[PDB]
Amino acid sequence: GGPPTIEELKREKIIPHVFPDENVDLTVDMYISFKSGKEVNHGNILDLAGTGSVPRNIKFSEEPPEDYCYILFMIDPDFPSRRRPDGRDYVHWAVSGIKSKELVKGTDKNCITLLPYVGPSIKKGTGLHRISFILSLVKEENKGNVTGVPLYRGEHYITRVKFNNCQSAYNVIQMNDMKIVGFNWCQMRRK
């Protein structure tokens, strides 16, 4: 739509459930395609089928500022269920270091994969999950020094529930003095 508007996010309760207030500066559009014909687009309904791999193509409307890079998180704020989101935020994916307007298959030479992609975790009968993608700026020098999200050593050393025991993506962003600049989401349920 370009980037989501504040009013859109309030309607869907992404503010305050994902972002606790209205002061986010969403200026960078983010196109996200799992595969041809399967795009994340401002709260559209996507089938769970075909989400087992990292999006094939992501495109940003602009490059990050000089000496900054993007860090991208994909989360489920509605985990395990929409009615009882006791694991909010579940972190599916965290990649840091993006310099390019295009990210193909989730990585390039610049990127550090802090949490490798794992697809949506949705049981039948758990409502619609607002599977969300949050794009922020991090200093290049800090791209692998994210408090709360250490360099990856395998699943034994982290948890995806409650954002690696830092509760939320927003908390991680703000405690690292990062700047949110983009957002997209879809709704997913298990048939």
Reference 55, options 74, 71, 78; nearest CA is 74
CATH number, domain of 163, equals 3.90.280.10
Reference 118, options 87, 91, 136, 95; nearest CA is 91
Asked if 129 contacts 122 with a C-beta cutoff of 8 angstroms, the reply is yes
Name the phi and psi angles at 124, rounded to 5: -55, 140
Asked if 135 contacts 114 with a C-beta cutoff of 8 angstroms, the reply is no
Alpha helix (H) ranges present in 22-115?
none
Output the DSSP codes for 114-151.
EE--------TTS--EEEEEEEEEEEGGGTT-BTTBPP
Alpha helix (H) ranges present in 57-155?
none
Token pair belonging to 155 = 């699943």
- Distance, in Å, from the CA atom of 165 to the CA atom of 184, rounded to the nearest integer, reads 24
Domain span at residue 36 reads 1-191
Residue 72: strand pairing partners = 95, 135
C-alpha to C-alpha distances, 151 to 14, 113, 138, 159, nearest whole angstrom: 28, 8, 15, 13
Asked if 129 contacts 82 with a C-beta cutoff of 8 angstroms, the reply is yes
Helices vs. strands in the chain: H and E counts, helices first: 4, 10
Residue carrying the six token digits 């994902």: 18
3-state secondary structure of 46: strand
3-state secondary structure of 107: coil
- The count of structural domains within the chain is 1
C-alpha to C-alpha distances, 187 to 25, 67, 92, nearest whole angstrom: 23, 34, 15
